[PDB]
Assembly symmetry: C5
């Protein structure tokens, strides 16, 4: 056949994302009633995260259909909200099953905001692109230190919940690996050679499968797993 | 009268599909509360599948109204999501009533992804149309081997659930026969003489009655049947 | 004043219908939880019927606003779905309160499909307008024989439910009288002198008050009546 | 500053109305679950009334944004539905707490339909504006006689419910005073000097605060009051 | 990079606000079921406030996308509704946990309406900008006197609820500090030098994070805190 053009792929992946995310949202929000009540905030936050994301992709697809332009800087609108919601999920899931300092919520949320807002300043010309990279990468390595070596990590080890053991590990691996895409997108788009925006929209669209959807399913399986482990122990 | 033009049929069948699918979705999601809880994920997945599908048809009808073009390659956006959701339904329904290796979920989902992604590469010019056919047909014969001769089949026979006996058979017959349309659409559109896109949009629209809606109703009757069989046995 | 033009009435009645139907839908779907559970499918089907209908009217009003044309042939999109849903309601309501052969569901649904699809072929030029009339009229007299002289009738008499006695009679009278509009619309528009499309859009819009909304309220009162009769007998 | 133009006010009040009404709707529909079940139809009808109204204002604001015209005759689309729903509320609230002839429902609904349909005929040029006034005013004085001197009045006095005593009085005062706006709008716009349509749109928009929203809150407080009085008496 | 233009920021912050607010709304409305029933009106009012706000931002973003203009006077549409809903929250939260005169509801709501309507008259040219400032500032200092030195304050001290102690303080600090933005916006835009509308849209958008969202979360934590304190005391 005649190859599809990246412009055709850019637009279709906005629809794909839009659909998958509204799907994930509704699923997470209808399955909110079948998990224990200890899991209800986790599931609401999950499902709302997917919805915000979906509304972004709806806004973006219309911009694209109308104009044929979808700047990369627009991605910070989504990430200011949804990357914050995803980081704070670590706290929410821990408060479902153990006791944890509320300080942790704030540590986590600040790191997320630093990581998005720093990269947004370099991207939008308000400060050097070099500096917004460094700040974005610092705000991310902080979040990693929280979850690998900090309170969230310890709380996790000392929870005793085997559902949370698995969520923490899986969510952490997505943030460690999945979320590496964001510093690297930035590095190339800004500090490096540069990258076609079409290419980078495709990349950012296709990685929101991992970074948002698999992230969701991991949370969902924890809530489901746990709900059931509590039922299986009631039987005994 | 003066015959309707296929262009008129193409556009109306997008509306028809849109309506039927939002209908099916809402029905499946409101009837989610009247089935046993063992059936709740099945019903949520069902209803969300219908919703994704509906949102596609909404996206497509607007493209059509605006442009009068509805490429066939756009169908892979729907199928990447909804054909995967339908294949994994076999697993979901089995996990409602029996114990099944989680491996099966992945076998099933990979086959679906191979079958859609392979046919999408040949369709969009990234690899030979011949090869995307072969791969799509392989990804489909795999799914069939799963459900006719593989674990899903055995799990089904050894479940003992008579609701699931009936779902499996009916869902299997739709995949065996209903889903033959997709390899054959592809074969003709790409590897064969060729086919008017209007004609093929009509065909793909009218077969989503079977492939999506009757598929849904089959799942719904199983969940309903079973819910009731459990109530009828509680009375004794 | 200066008379409104039928074009002004055509467009306003699309809005009226749209509003009334989304209203009816939401009401039927929120009152689904206050009827017995034996009535839940009836109420979901009712409310979904109204919703499909509403989405049609939304699609049509946009076509009208944009183009000032609203072909009559577009009505078959609605009727293929909603006339089938309304005919099968007879079965659904009977299965709420008595035992009935599942065959009846199919008898009923085939008649509905014959009646819509036959008149759609004559309307869209695929077969003689004469023949599509005859077939549409045959598919309708069949449905009437079902409900006046056939199993549905007997099941109704032998149910003993006084709520269903009333629904059956009222729904039957709407199909006997209300639905006469459809053969006659067809006869005039196609086989007869002809009729302004504006006039006929107005007529079809204003009769969806009877044919859809009063039809709904009749079903709703049965479910409500019965739910209450069961509560009043529990008190004794 | 430089005065806002009435055109600017007309358009903003459509948005204001739209927002307030979708707000009221959702509130009434979520608070439907916290009132006694005897109040559930009242609350569903309330919330659906607000929703129909909101959908009107959405339809109208788009017409305005596109065209800069919002005829007054368009108001009869809303009023044919929502004035009927509001009049029949008297019956619904009485059937929540006492026994009342079903005849009353019909008396009430006919008066509403006469009052809207008569004024719509004079407005749209089908009969003399004089006569449509007289008929609209007759259909309104009838409704008033029902609720001041007729069965609804008696049923209210003989109910004994103090929540309903208060609703009836408040709803009656809105219909007596609030709804006087409609005959007077009509009189001036048609039978009298005439009135700028911008002015009259503003007036009709700002009076739907009373006539729809305060009307709603009155119903809501009755349902709430009563629900609570029944709980306070259960404690004793 | 090349700096983003304030026009680019104005449009993106409308989307940001839109997304965050629909997010907050849905979260507050799904978490309505996990708080005590004493908190249900608070949570419904909260979530509906967020929704009205979101619908505004949707209306505004379309105006902007179409026209590139977003007058500041449009903000009074939102504030007439949502500032009233936020002020009356003080009453709603007090009626959740203590007994309070219904008079307070009205004191509070009048202050809110005076504060918005006065500033809207000066803004839209109907009265001197000076006078609309004074009135807006008076309507605000009144609300502050209510909540710092008036009944609401006393009711709060005499409630004994420690969740409400915290909400009152936090909501009060947002109104004292957060809401200072509104008098000062007005002062500068109208009575003072003047201010770019782009700048002021950015400022008003970014302060609806505090003034609406943090306001919400404060209410949500009170309802959550309390619900739990009541569960923890039931255990003892
Ligand atoms: C008793 C169980 C009933 C489950 C009802 C769940 C409904 C809430 C989840 C759906 C919310 C969708 C929000 C869409 C908003 C889009 C704008
Ligand atoms: C028991 C202690 C509390 C547990 C649950 C806490 C629930 C909070 C969940 C909502 C957090 C949302 C954070 C969204 C960040 C958006 C920030 C945008 C700034 C521009
Ligand atoms: C301890 C839980 C705190 C939850 C409040 C969420 C604040 C959201 C800010 C954006
Ligand atoms: C919360 C986001 C962090 C942004 C820090 C900006 C630092 C700029 C310093 C040099 C100018
Ligand atoms: C702060 C940089 C990211 C920390 C990574 C974690 C290092 C070791 C974890 C051991 C388990
Ligand atoms: C049992 C495992 C199923 C988890 C859901 C996985 C969904 C992945 C979407 C690509
Ligand atoms: C019976 C099911 C209906 C099939 C499709 C009807 C499509 C008709 C749309 C016609 C649009 C413009 C015609 C002039
Ligand atoms: C042990 C019980 C487990 C039940 C698992 C429920 C998971 C259902 C949701 C699965 C959806 C998977 C298909 C998602 C479609 C998109 C995948 C690839 C897109 C590129
Ligand atoms: C899991 C999805 C994989 C689908 C495509 C697999 C095959 C890609 C093409 C291989 C041959 C290229 C030469
Ligand atoms: C020609 C105009 C639009 C083409 C849309 C292409 C869709 C590309 C993305 C498909 C992703 C699913 C592949 C499996
Ligand atoms: C019950 C008999 C099963 C025969 C299976 C036929 C082959 C399935 C699909 C091809 C692999
Ligand atoms: C038992 C009879 C119900 C059958 C399920 C509905 C089929 C719908 C087909 C369109
Ligand atoms: C009694 C209610 C019936 C309403 C019928 C329809 C009236 C709609 C009129 C819309 C007029 C638009 C343009 C008029 C100039
Ligand atoms: C046995 C208990 C009752 C179960 C019946 C469930 C009925 C579900 C609704 C049936 C749907 C009717 C068919 C609507 C679509 C018609 C097919 C369109 C073909 C183009
Ligand atoms: C499901 C019923 C479909 C409608 C009946 C169609 C009959 C067509 C007869 C054609 C005769 C051609 C000469
Ligand atoms: C030109 C009119 C001819 C109509 C033929 C009569 C068919 C009526 C249906 C018979 C049952
Ligand atoms: C009551 C008994 C009615 C008998 C006659 C019904 C005739 C309707 C059949 C139409 C063909
Ligand atoms: C007791 C009244 C029940 C019927 C209500 C609806 C009547 C039709 C509405 C038009
Ligand atoms: C206090 C409520 C104010 C309602 C009217 C607001 C109208 C403003 C719209 C102006 C847009 C163009 C300048
Ligand atoms: C017990 C849980 C309470 C959930 C109630 C949810 C249903 C009420 C909200 C329905 C909103 C309907 C709005 C549809 C608008 C269509 C256009
Ligand atoms: C309790 C017995 C009487 C029934 C009470 C409910 C009345 C029917 C529901 C209201 C129907 C709304 C009609 C709107 C007209 C347009
Ligand atoms: C003036 C209108 C009177 C309508 C009521 C008729 C009686 C209906 C009985 C049921
Ligand atoms: C001279 C013509 C006299 C016409 C009178 C028209 C009366 C219409 C009143 C509306 C009735 C609505 C049904 C109740
Ligand atoms: C009885 C209600 C109507 C009386 C007014 C008749 C019209 C007066 C002429 C203007
Ligand atoms: C309670 C006192 C009722 C006094 C009489 C009220 C007259 C209302 C009549 C309305 C016009 C017919
Ligand atoms: C009983 C406390 C007062 C609640 C009043 C309900 C809202 C009043 C009208 C809003 C405008
Ligand atoms: C993290 C900060 C989030 C605020 C985003 C500011 C708006 C960016 C939108 C830019 C639109 C670009 C058009 C060129
Ligand atoms: C069992 C829990 C179910 C809660 C469902 C209700 C949650 C609120 C959904 C309301 C969303 C309304 C969307 C606005 C419609 C108009 C735009
Ligand atoms: C127990 C006493 C009752 C407590 C609950 C009262 C519920 C009130 C909730 C609604 C208040 C909204 C009032 C502001 C709406 C905007 C008014 C705009 C006027 C132009
Ligand atoms: C409550 C309504 C608040 C309105 C405040 C406006 C007062 C206007 C004073 C004008 C003086 C010339
Ligand atoms: C309290 C009074 C509000 C301030 C008014 C100061 C005078 C304004 C003109 C500069
Ligand atoms: C809460 C104890 C401190 C009292 C502060 C009094 C001043 C409050 C602001 C009033 C505005 C007029």
């Amino acid at each position: 056949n005649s190859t599809l053009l990246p412009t055709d792929i850019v637009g279709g992946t906005f629809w794909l994302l839009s659909m998958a995310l509204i799907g994930a949202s509704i699923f997470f929000l209808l399955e909110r009633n079948r998990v224990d009540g200890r899991w209800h905030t986790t599931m609401t936050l999950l499902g709302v995260t997917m919805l915000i994301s979906a509304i972004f992709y709806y806004y973006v697809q219309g911009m694209w259909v109308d104009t044929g332009k979808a700047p990369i800087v627009l991605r910070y609108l989504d990430w200011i909200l949804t990357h914050s919601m995803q980081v704070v999920m670590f706290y929410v899931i821990l408060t479902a099953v153990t006791k944890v300092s509320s300080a942790l919520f704030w540590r986590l949320l600040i790191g997320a905001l630093v990581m998005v807002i720093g990269e947004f300043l370099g991207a939008a010309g308000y400060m050097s692109a070099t500096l917004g990279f460094i700040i974005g990468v610092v705000g991310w390595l902080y979040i990693l230190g929280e979850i690998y070596m900090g309170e969230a990590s310890r709380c996790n080890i000392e929870s005793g919940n085997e559902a949370t053991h698995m969520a923490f590990n899986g969510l952490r691996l997505i943030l460690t690996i999945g979320w590496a895409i964001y510093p690297l997108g930035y590095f190339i788009n800004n500090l490096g050679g540069g990258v076609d925006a079409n290419s980078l929209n495709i990349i950012y669209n296709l990685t929101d499968f991992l970074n948002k959807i698999i992230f969701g399913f991991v949370v969902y399986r924890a809530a489901m797993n746990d709900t059931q482990a509590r039922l299986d122990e009631i039987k005994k």
